[model samples]
Target: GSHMATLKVIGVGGGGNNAVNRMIDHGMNNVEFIAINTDGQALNLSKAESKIQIGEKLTRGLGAGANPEIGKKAAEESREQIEDAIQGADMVFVTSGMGGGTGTGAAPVVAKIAKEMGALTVGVVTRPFSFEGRKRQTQAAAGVEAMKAAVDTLIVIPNDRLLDIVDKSTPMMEAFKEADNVLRQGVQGISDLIAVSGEVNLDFADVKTIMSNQGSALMGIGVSSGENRAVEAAKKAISSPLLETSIVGAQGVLMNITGGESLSLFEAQEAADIVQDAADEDVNMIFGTVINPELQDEIVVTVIATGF
Candidate 1:
């Protein structure tokens, strides 16, 4: 079952540098990293990988401020360099920080190019922190809409949401690091769902379904504390199916629980049984993540139900 899939990683402008680094650090291979920054320093940072430098000396106007003419030029340059890289790509993950010149302006152009080359484009955009001001928020929203118009799907990670998840008092760098880590995990989750092969793995149909029901889906994972609470929690979480239909078209499911606490195989089965009972046997795939922090001390489970 060898399905050849190309995953092209395009980072727009300076804001995407961290995401590029995070992906590389996560050991994602078969990725072509492109940076569209206008600064010499930004270009230098991304030079270690297959990169692109847009603009020179100006240090701005990569995308956000790009008019039709500017966008045309950027698209031409990007297509010239990476057109082949994007051909027939199963998925192209475009990452960028919104509200900036490069990411805000050029991401849509790159997405259009990818789509034109017959690739399913997915944009992973990071929005600014809520406190960063309203203008950035507006720009980020606009960028998302633009990218979505050109791409098949867009997975947005809002900095404001990440703020609530991480320690609020943490320093800016630390908060950013946490945000990056979360984003990487999310990216890897989707990538693994698409790339990994298994006897009972998810396929394109599942992905399409999940994407269709993304907004209403709820996902949570937890460890079992031997009280059968995992089932209870799952039932509670899914007490109300968001959709009029059953949870049958799930694209994928990945669940992992680890705490050095040994539970009977029956217990593990019971935990799963509970989920199946609630969501029905419609789940497509299941994986695991080691439980930690608020997620520890239980049989970690994550359920994404449509019709939320």
Candidate 2:
């Protein structure tokens, strides 16, 4: 059966739910969304086709209330429900903010279940900001460790990185929005790159080859055109401060160079070289070039580097 791969994004808690909701708000297509939570109200607020309220007996539909132990217990207590949400998912993205109770504790459990079920599980997570306090930082660090061990590929975006990306005059809420966008783009770009048919093909196998069992991944998208467009787009594609990592020792890179009718093989090769030079000499690099009329004067490069 040459069936399309089942791609799913599951939110593990309030923060996780928020990420899902934000992605939905941005109109990400061709994937199913699921929300798992201990709090009934938070789950209600989460926008997803499927919602599972875990730990109802323990928390009595109340909430984890900032206690990760309770969140972990809630997830453990409702394994069947979580499994139902993850069933038949070929690729599952478990998303959450790593400092809170439900997300920090429950996300790892949800990711572990997806991995055990033989799904290519990726965790898109966020670390708390320094202003959120040292206790949250410790909790988030622990959560990141747990998720890294559980999922196939872990993309941890530190919240403080938002400050680095945005201007000083940027409002606080937009910074939060940008934080969620980082996770959204990671999921959207990876899925879209593989799902769409391009002049040069990059299949799901290529993505799995790069991302599977690879811990700590980095991804970025750059759009440009005209003179040096290839180099400019490639540089922007790999130059995000969000993940706080470099492609120095990466095991593999998945890059897509897309443009209009004017795209040249030399341009694509040049863009590929930009990314290639950043990684180890012998690293496996897979690239695809796409032609889209909508991008008449623009070249967009989408890249993912893993195996740190």
Candidate 3:
């Protein structure tokens, strides 16, 4: 295995424990995980191989009602810690549950530090369930805006989408586990594809281009989905002038389509076409993934398009 010398994972706030545990459960052996929180309780619960607890006086809540000023201060403190951690890492992954004091507040600062230190910073945000109420939704939106302002790439996992995928009626705890599983699976899928295929690779330069363009990069997972179909779906997603104009540069694509009973080449091709049609400019690179799942029509397409 080619070890990425500069790979670091930082988790913030109470939800930090869940993200760290999920990463460990998914067998991410190469990266270093650091958990940051004011409460010693979360530090104890974290399963990450490495952890950093920032003893800042921060409370958990939402919106302006929450301690926004304190949250910002705590983030500034965490920024120093993150700076020390990401000095030589090639890639930095910052995980947080949005709409809170610590995670939502400190995440962007840490991300900025990582990017300034020359690491490719990726923010993985878990948003609150929409049903939680308008307050939670508002907080999530605010957190997302703050994070997007700082991080190079943002990957959001909304609880509502996870619920649709898992058992909606399950207890909160069980549902959380299912949602975490989905998030981890998505991360693992991308990691494995990058590590194994090595066909469509993204270098620091490509990452910079993506950040500059503010374009959303999507990850589509299915069996034997070709370049053409994926492109079409992507085009559809970016039909709006807002998304289309924001995209500047793209990476060469990587595709992995496993020949299976559930997914056929035709479906894959159609997905590729959807992606290709979305971008008026040349797509830098493309990658495909084919996996065997229960349903033949079980195709998952994830795209990240930037907006101005």
Candidate 4:
């Protein structure tokens, strides 16, 4: 088998591990998946290719008890294990639910280790709900700062933003599921950019350049099927709620389009123009279009907008 450079996703703790499990189950392939946590039971539940349980002595298979210091210590105690799990990965996605112990504390540590090993690291982190009170939300914000320092691009999605999109009657599990799916979509966006060979390929170097040039980037994804899918997908991305319409000053916009055989040059041009107009007039735009036979009539557009 050809030894392709590895792309891996690391789910940090309970929420993080759960998201990774869902992504793998949703047919994300051609990459490695890892779940790390202090909870032995939670780590045992992951279907990922690799799983690591940290802090054997401290938590002793228990969780971090919502204490971030405990989580940091756990990661430190098992630093070697985290490094080993991430070894050989040239690109890494580190995701966690903030405001908690293991995921919050260890995420930055893991991201730092990955970057140290010369891997491009991106983080998709969640913030606490408005009702979760100020303490946890404050903790999550601080954690985000740490992660941003460690990773190349940190995309923060607040739970409240997702709540706004869902119906009030939606079940708790359904809401969480929807949010986790969004995380997977963000991961797939970057994955498609590098993994799928497009008509105008956007390789890892392109990704690194755009992400490193911009700070914690904002990622938005849109999916549409039928005629004019490219333009429609791009339109949806520009107004995508994931970004919360905060794209006024994006300095770098990396637009990636993947669609069925239905994709056209006109649609790509429209997409480029849409973002160019939606963002600051002086924004840097890097665009690519790819064909995915599996997409059938559906088109998926992913935008990484940064320099906020």
Candidate 5:
């Protein structure tokens, strides 16, 4: 069965706004981009359909200055608008870079509102680098915990990942850019399944069943080109360090396959085998496939394996 779904990607605070803006540059159809911030000037820079400002009374169009309480207060000041931000979304992705006030304070409040409204919500947030000091790290950790209670799945990326993936002394802006790269891919991985019609679709029920859980989730996407794309994509995805979990005793698995009209039945089944190999013998697996005419000689495998 094929289904049409609407999804909204929201960037919260300064860091969040920047990351979401980058996603907009990459392009997404049938998905709306939104930016929310306490800083009026910064919010104006975003290329999203909707731009929201919170804590106007408190910050007076300024920023939260890394103060979590003020960030929470700002969202409170404009609670009505924040609630309205998610009015008609079937699903939502809330992203922020914590260790700062706005993302730490307001993001969870936004998540709480969406969950209460019955929307499937996922949070993508980044923690501060070790150089940022114990205080910011402390704040980011607290923010992650708060949001955990509100969203079904929360993916937290610590800055330390950049060190191993990139370099120990990577420039600040460049490292942030890399962080956005990983974050956006993860969001797109989920979107490829739920946003468009799937030959073998994953419905809202399937999403909820896999997402309703405790603890963290593993998400990563792998793309491959050329003749061996399907297998390469699946192997890269299943073996990805980002989505690493011992499949032997996992609780659940959700896999999505996307490719062109020329996609082969043999290629599809082989790709699925890669996923099953990474799962427990009796796991409940939900697989979704999407075909796009614009895609040729390319394939993408998006895996969201849960049991955190």
Candidate 6:
């Protein structure tokens, strides 16, 4: 096979491990999956390609018990293994649910190691739902602050936002799964941007340029096969309720359009323009079109707005 960018997704702790499992189930391609956790049982449940159980002696493979300091030490205890797992990757995506111990505390440590290793590191994290309580939310906020300095770019999906989008009676597990789906979309979008060659290629350099050192980023995705598909997809792409912030003031935007042979340049242009118009007047806009013959009548637009 030809050389492609080495992409690694590290799921840290319970929530993170679940995210990795969801991505696997969704069939995300051409990436290595690593699950790191302080709980042996949790790690055993993960479907990641590689799994590391941190703090063998410190936590006795029990768990971090919702304490971040213990989580940090767990990562430190197995620092060398974390580094080894991430070694040689051109880019890394660290996914976690940012309230509990391992994911919250060890995520920064893991991402910082990845950053120091010179990989293009991005963190996809989730904030706890409102019902999870104000304390967890506060902890998640502090975790985000720590993560900001460690990763090149950060995408936060607020779980409470699900209330606004999903039905009031949605099952608890399904609601959490939807949150994982949001993270999956962002990670898949970025991977597709570089891995799949298209009419207008957005290579690693292009991605690195936009994402490097960007504090926060937002993502929206739209898929449709009906009338006014272009415009409809664009509207949904910028209206993802899972995003913590709006794309209106983003300094740069990256759009990827996927459609069948039925797709036309005009349709792509329409979709691109719709999203571009929603951002700042001078927003640096970059886009690409990918031909997915299986799409038939469908068009999928993925928008990632950065430099928030």
Highest TM-score among the candidates is held by which one?
2
Clashing pairs in 2: none
CA lDDT scores, all candidates in order: 0.56, 0.85, 0.57, 0.81, 0.78, 0.86
For 216-244, candidate 3 gives per-residue lDDT tens digits of: 44333332234444344444333322111
Model 6 lDDT tens row, 133-225 = 998888888889999989998988888787887786888778778777766777677777777888777777877888889988877788888
Ranking by lDDT: 6, 2, 4, 5, 3, 1
lDDT of 2 by residue, 47-124 (tens): 899999988887888877778888898888888888887889888989898888889899999999998887899888
Cα-lDDT of candidate 4: 0.81
Better of 2 and 3 by TM-score: 2
| Stretches > 4 Å off in candidate 3 | 1-5, 57-66, 166-168, 181-183, 197-215, 223-271, 277-284, 287-308
lDDT of 4 by residue, 124-210 (tens): 888989899999998888888888889988878788887777886878877777777656776777766766678887877777778
Model 4: lowest-lDDT 10 consecutive positions:
238-247
Which scores better on TM-score, 1 or 3?
Answer: 3
Candidate 2 positional error at 89, Å: 1.1
The TM-score, computed over Cα atoms with residue i paired to residue i, of candidate 3 is 0.69
**Considering every candidate listed, which one attains the maximal lDDT?**
6
The C-alpha stretches of model 1 lying farther than 4 A from their native spots are: 30-32, 56-73, 166-169, 194-196, 212-308
Name the weakest run of 10 consecutive residues (lDDT summed) in model 3: 238-247
Candidate 6, residue 236: the lDDT equals 87
What is the C-alpha RMSD, rounded to one decimal, of candidate 1? 6.8
Candidate 4 residue pairs that clash: none
RMSD over all Cα atoms, model 2: 1.7
Model 1 / residue 168 / CA error / Å = 5.8
Candidates in order, TM-scores: namely: 0.66, 0.94, 0.69, 0.91, 0.85, 0.93
RMSD of every candidate to native, in Å, equals 6.8, 1.7, 6.5, 2.4, 3.1, 1.9
